[PDB]
Design a protein around this nucleic acid. Structure first.
Lengths: 136, 179, 80, 32, 110, 49
RNA sequence: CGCGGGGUGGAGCAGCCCGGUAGCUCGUCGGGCACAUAACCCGAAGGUCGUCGGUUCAAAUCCGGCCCCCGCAACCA
RNA sequence: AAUCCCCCGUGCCCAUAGCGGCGUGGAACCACCCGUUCCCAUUCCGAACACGGAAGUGAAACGCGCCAGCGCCGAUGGUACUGGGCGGGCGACCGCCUGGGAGAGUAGGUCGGUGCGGGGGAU
RNA sequence: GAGAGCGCAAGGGUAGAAGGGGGCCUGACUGCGAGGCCUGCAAGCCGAGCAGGGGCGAAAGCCGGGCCUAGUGAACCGGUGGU
RNA sequence: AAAUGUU
């Protein structure tokens, strides 16, 4: 969870539409609605997919955080310099693939990306592979 | 001695034309300039070596200009982006075949280890650098004449194509090989 | 900084656009381009001031053209 | 070619080497 | 990408700017002492010249003077060319000159 | 204005000055140059103040 | 998170007004006198100036980061 | 000249004009080339710039000629976005009507186009 | 295909070069200014061309401070030089 | 002027 040698330290808000089509593992939980998603829910699902599996499982993570937070700490009258950043987030707009799987094709594998998509406040869906388009 | 080496070249190479082609004579193998670089860099101090080293190589050959700037200002010693470093001299046609056969024939075994001058692996692709020389062994002069001899360089350039187009040339001219 | 907010420094801005677009009969002395760096090289009958400001030199019609690799040129073509 | 500054090399090839048989280079050790 | 004929494209260019004057460009190869008078703003050649068209041969250098002495009379034969200049290839010395000194017989104002 | 100076140069024949700047440390040698006064001759002035 | 001061031998300190050049006090070791100690008398060793880079013919000395030590207040799970 | 074809100077379109691979030129033109006093010049060198000129040669450089592996421009058909209208949503946000309409990708494209003036060939 | 450099911060720009090196010199000057961009006033900015007298160049030509945008503050009251 | 010594 290092994001070291940063460019700029404070950022802005606002986002509405989104893309980034189907991926190519064996199974991946796919989003439906937009929501910010912190750097800790990702780690929670990364632990809960692993310790279900078989003391062995493999996972490909496709979501990474950039945008920083602000809090203005506890009881402050407004109107000063907005600071004090903290642990910080990513963005997933309608449809791009989170967390594709090791590929052992069982409901042994299909259950873990139900119990991982049971935190993570988005509403998800489960798919597999027949896409086979072309990119660069 | 200059025409004496001219006729040696021009009566050994038409004898030794008989391994390539016979066509387009003016398109085989020929020699070019010779650069000699003193390359001291020890006169980051006073400009006393810039006169003192400029009267023995310039007394063997043509004058010794100060192509001596340093382009940058790394650490080591505060050179002060400038000063002088290089001590280059260029030789073209006449002092060319003065200096070449003068260093080759009647002077060179004043050096030790006697393995010609070549450990046979110069590994050029283009115009074939060489040059194994530590300063003031046998040029013409008298037994010390300076303090702290500093080692010189030689870089012949040719118009050859493969490695053997100057390996065979400089070996049928002389220049003993093998380590 | 130190532990607060140290900003709130800015400057009232110059204008520097294009003043005398295609067509538009001009007379000798009008400023055609205020710019910061050379983005429009001069042509015939167009001078170039001290800080890269183009200005008409004789009377006529401002006419834009390009060159491609070399760059955009402007020049004022005589009136009739 | 600057004609005044470079050193003099008119006869500084035509000698035998200012004494060659003391210089020990002609038949000196280079043979097999 | 450009092998040291950059001065020719830099010096000549700085000349085009003042388009109130007409140019003569010379060539200076061996049996080739050529010149041309170009009117700039309409790209043509206004009048030609000669080194071997007019033959004028020998084995010499004074043919360079001869060509300019021809360009003088051939300029004032149409008579309008009062104002013109002269560039060249590189350095302006002997061979490239006599052309200027030959055009200085007809009153070419340079 | 620590090392720079406001110097004010006069003539080798006459009156008042022609107002310029000087360094005082890297040159020191009392400068002199050539200019056109209101007596129309292009004479040489000297650092006088 | 904060306010100002400092990094020099084993420890404590001058040298930083303004560019050239490293010293003092305690303290460790070795030889002296004395029946053996204490005290006293001679001599020697122990660094570059926290850490990395810039400016000049020349940085302990002027500039920028990085990291430590001195004191004041409010608080998280 | 006042009908066509190779060469040599100048301009404009402006990389669908370039890089890389192999052949092909001197009878005429051109460049290497031979020398070094003056005409000149090289922080040193006639390597460049300049001078006086047979030979030998077209190998190097330059022009026509070919081959799409690298580059370079690139359709039709769709979709995102949106000028102007109406709708549904607690909240991030979505839908339909009417005019416009990209970027990436696919089939494919080319190893340039063109004036002005001189010297020769078909007379 | 310029991704280096240009006294100091960032953006624009530039090798058909404002970038590095030598040759000679002070236009880092004086009856002076048509015409404009900006603007509540006051301020700031660019400027072809005549006349005087001069530098570099064979000529063509260019020069009234620096590659450009920051290094500055109205009046009143006083000081020193000429008219 | 100038100290101490049973382990």
């Amino acid at each position: 969870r290092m994001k070291y040698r940063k460019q700029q330290r404070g950022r802005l808000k606002g986002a509405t539409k989104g893309g980034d089509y189907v991926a190519f593992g064996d199974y991946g939980l796919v989003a439906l609605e937009p929501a910010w998603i912190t750097a800790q829910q990702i780690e929670a699902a990364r632990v809960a997919m692993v310790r279900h599996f078989r003391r062995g499982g493999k996972i490909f993570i496709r979501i990474f955080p950039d945008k920083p937070y602000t809090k203005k700490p506890l009881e402050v009258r407004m109107g000063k310099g907005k600071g004090n950043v903290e642990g910080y987030v990513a963005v997933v707009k309608p449809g791009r693939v989170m967390f594709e799987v090791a590929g052992v094709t069982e409901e042994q594998a299909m259950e873990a990306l139900r119990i991982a998509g049971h935190k993570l406040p988005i509403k998800t869906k489960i798919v597999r592979r027949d896409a086979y388009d072309e990119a660069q | 001695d200059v025409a004496l080496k001219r006729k040696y070249y021009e009566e050994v190479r038409p004898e030794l034309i008989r391994r390539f082609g016979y066509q387009n004579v003016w398109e085989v193998p020929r020699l070019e300039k010779v650069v000699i670089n003193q390359g001291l860099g020890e006169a980051k101090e006073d400009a006393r070596i810039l006169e003192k080293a400029a009267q023995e190589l310039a007394l063997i050959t043509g004058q010794k200009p100060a192509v001596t700037r340093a382009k940058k200002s790394i650490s080591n010693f505060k050179l002060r982006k400038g000063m002088p470093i290089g001590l280059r001299v260029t030789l073209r046609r006449d002092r060319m075949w003065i200096f070449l056969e003068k260093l080759l024939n009647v002077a060179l075994p004043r050096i030790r280890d006697f393995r010609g001058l070549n450990p046979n692996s110069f590994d050029g692709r283009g115009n074939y650098n060489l040059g194994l020389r530590e300063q003031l062994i046998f040029p013409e002069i008298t037994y010390d004449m300076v303090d702290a001899l500093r080692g010189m360089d030689i870089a012949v350039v040719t118009t050859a194509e493969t490695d053997e187009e100057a390996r065979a040339l400089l070996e049928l001219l002389g220049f003993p090989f093998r380590k | 900084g130190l532990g607060s907010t140290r900003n709130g420094r800015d400057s009232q801005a110059k204008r520097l656009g294009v003043k005398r677009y295609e067509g538009q009969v001009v007379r000798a002395g009008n400023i055609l381009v205020r710019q910061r760096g050379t983005r429009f090289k001069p042509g015939k009958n167009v001078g170039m001031g001290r800080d890269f400001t183009l200005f008409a030199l004789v009377d006529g019609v401002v006419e834009f053209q390009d060159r491609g690799r070399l760059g955009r040129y402007v020049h004022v073509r005589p009136l009739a | 070619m600057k004609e005044g500054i470079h050193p003099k090399l008119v006869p500084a090839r035509i000698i035998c080497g200012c004494g060659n048989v003391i210089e020990t280079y002609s038949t000196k050790p280079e043979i097999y | 990408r450009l092998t040291a004929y950059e001065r020719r494209k830099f010096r000549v260019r700085n000349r085009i700017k003042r388009t109130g004057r007409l140019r003569l460009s010379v060539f200076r190869s061996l049996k080739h002492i050529y010149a041309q008078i170009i009117d700039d703003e309409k790209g043509v050649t206004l009048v030609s010249a000669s080194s071997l068209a007019l033959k004028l041969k020998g084995n010499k250098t004074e043919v360079a003077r001869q060509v300019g002495r021809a360009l003088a009379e051939k300029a004032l034969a149409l008579g309008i060319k009062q104002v013109a200049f002269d560039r060249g290839p590189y350095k302006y010395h002997g061979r490239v000159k006599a052309l200027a000194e030959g055009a200085r017989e007809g009153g070419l104002e340079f | 204005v620590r090392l720079k100076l406001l110097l004010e140069c006069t003539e080798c024949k006459r009156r008042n000055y022609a107002t310029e700047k000087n360094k005082r440390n890297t040159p020191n040698k009392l400068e002199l140059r050539k200019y056109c006064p209101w007596c129309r001759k292009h004479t040489v002035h000297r650092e006088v103040k």
